Amino acid sequence: SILTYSGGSCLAMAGDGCFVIVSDNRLGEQLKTISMEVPKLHVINESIVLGLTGLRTDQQTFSEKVRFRNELYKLREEREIGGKAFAALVSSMLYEARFGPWFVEPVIASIDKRTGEVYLCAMDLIGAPCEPEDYVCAGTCAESLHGMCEALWRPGLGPEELFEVAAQAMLSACDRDSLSGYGAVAAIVTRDKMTTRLINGRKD
Amino acid sequence: SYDRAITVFSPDGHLFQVEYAQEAVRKGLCAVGVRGKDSIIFAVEKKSVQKLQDSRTIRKIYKLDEHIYLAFAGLSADARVLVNHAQLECQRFRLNYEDAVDVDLLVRYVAKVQQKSTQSSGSRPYGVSTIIGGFNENGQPHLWKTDPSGMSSAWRAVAIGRNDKTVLEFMEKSYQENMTRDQCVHFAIKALLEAVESGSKNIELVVLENKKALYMGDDELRKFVVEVEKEREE
């Protein structure tokens, strides 16, 4: 499969006026490992983080299109885009390419700066949104991420407990996956601050 | 889409759009080219010295490729378009034929771009003349001039723009075969100051040698204008 060629996984969870998003650091060509220092997270503005997985040429190209449109948005509109409009926009671009797709699967995580309400979205490769309240994930160890989060996640959590949940998840899931791994990077976002952490993991 | 016929004949074989394009060249600042043994010298008049103009002035002598320069007279914006097409053309040629375009070839490309603009419905002619100089890969210099009609031709030295005819007359007497690099600069500056007022910072100057080019500085150009202002009092 083509969505698994390059490797990688991403996960985002919500808490109470916070989220965490994590990605692994591996880039590959099927089983051959090219780099161990490629995190898949992109910061859009103070409020929005983008995760992309799938084929790396299309992650690289589709994030450059997102960046381009965002810059023009900011000059026309003289403001930052909100999490929900950014996701609707992303969706529109994936579906523009409905009969010849970008092989990416995005994970968007955001927070309304005013109301402190957290918006999560994940998309299939033609832009169908899946917007639950607990978590989202994508990439080569998404099956194994589901059950980690169903058993560790709980409503209400604050930044530091949400960070442990979300790091134990990513590590235990990457460790049963041959195409994602080499530890992780996590962004933790509140209305007030954005913390980043590089987490240690296995060297296989 | 606009398709009107702009350039047409009128009752005695006159194409007025072409004539008036050549009028626009006569009002433009003076430019000069002078072919030595193994160097070409392009020299142009700049508008006028100001305190405010930027010391690093914009250049009015353009590079078309590693071994071919262009100076012009006339509508400066039209010329910038023309220089673009010519830069594209040289690179297109490397891509289609691996070797580097010959000056004489590049001149016919440009001249045909000018000619087409005299016959293409929808469009007026460029208002530009060019002087294009460069080397073969056997090291022998060439200097060409192109005019708005699209006619090209090779010269040993040439002037265009304002006071074209006066400079050209001075140069018919004084020109000499196999001038050195320094003689060529001397002779080019001299030629210019028949049209121009002073020679402080209203002259830019390229010395195009085989395997080098120089946009002369203001230290070396002052040195030559005073060697030449001293000779004009005799």
């Binding site: - | 047409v8 004949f9 005695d12 006159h14 194409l15 000619q115 016959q119 090209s152 018919e172």
Partner: protein, 229 residues
């Protein structure tokens, strides 16, 4: 000038754009061709605008193909476009049927393109003498902005036209030699030129029936003709 369009007819059935284009050719250099039985000869006045011009670069004689050459008069830059279509047609012929284009076909092909205007804004202000040898011996054809083309035993075009067509209705007989045409050529150039005549100041070419190749004369060999006068 814009009061009436590019297509308008005059009250005596001429198209204005074409009349005016023909006037343009009159203000040209002078050029001519002469047909003997052995050969066909072409020549032109150069007319440089100073002694700083390298004269090589201002040719009014161009090879279309090994067996035919042209001399142009009127707007040189427009002629470049015709002479390029003709070079391409002559080579398409050889590509498709492995033999040289006839001279008449070449004149026909160059005239088709003359009248494509309404597309181009205006006619070409150009006339061409095409000269060459095929199977019908030495030939000389002339095209003009109307798109008429026509075969001639000897013609001239340009500023000195009307004066060269009274040195023709006198000295021109059908039955002359190479020599007498090469000399009659230079006789007419001397007449209707403004300058004094020199080896650098004129161009001469021949296509002899002997070999079927255009040859362009050196300045060494043009000395020999001014001498014979």
């Amino acid at each position: 000038e814009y009061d009436r369009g590019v297509n308008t007819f005059s009250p005596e059935g001429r198209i204005f754009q074409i009349e005016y284009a023909i006037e343009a050719i009159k203000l040209g250099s002078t050029s001519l061709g002469i047909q003997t039985p052995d050969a066909v000869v072409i020549a032109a006045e150069k007319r440089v605008p100073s002694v700083l011009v390298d004269p090589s670069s201002m040719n009014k004689i161009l090879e279309i193909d090994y067996h035919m050459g042209t001399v142009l008069s009127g707007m040189v830059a427009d002629a470049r476009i015709l002479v390029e279509h003709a070079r391409v047609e002559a080579q398409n012929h050889r590509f498709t049927y492995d033999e040289p284009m006839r001279v008449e076909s070449c004149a026909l092909a160059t005239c088709d393109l003359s009248v494509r205007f309404g597309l181009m804004s205006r006619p070409f202000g150009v006339s061409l003498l095409i000269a060459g040898v095929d199977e019908n011996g030495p030939q000389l054809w002339q095209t003009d902005p109307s798109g008429t083309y026509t075969r001639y035993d000897a013609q001239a075009i340009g500023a000195g036209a009307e004066a060269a067509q009274t040195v023709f209705n006198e000295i021109y007989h059908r039955n002359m030699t190479v020599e007498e045409a090469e000399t009659l050529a230079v006789r007419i150039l001397k007449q209707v030129m403004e300058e004094e005549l020199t080896k650098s100041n004129i161009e001469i070419a021949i296509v002899p029936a002997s070999t079927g190749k255009l040859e362009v004369y050196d300045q060494t060999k043009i000395q020999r003709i001014i001498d014979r006068l």
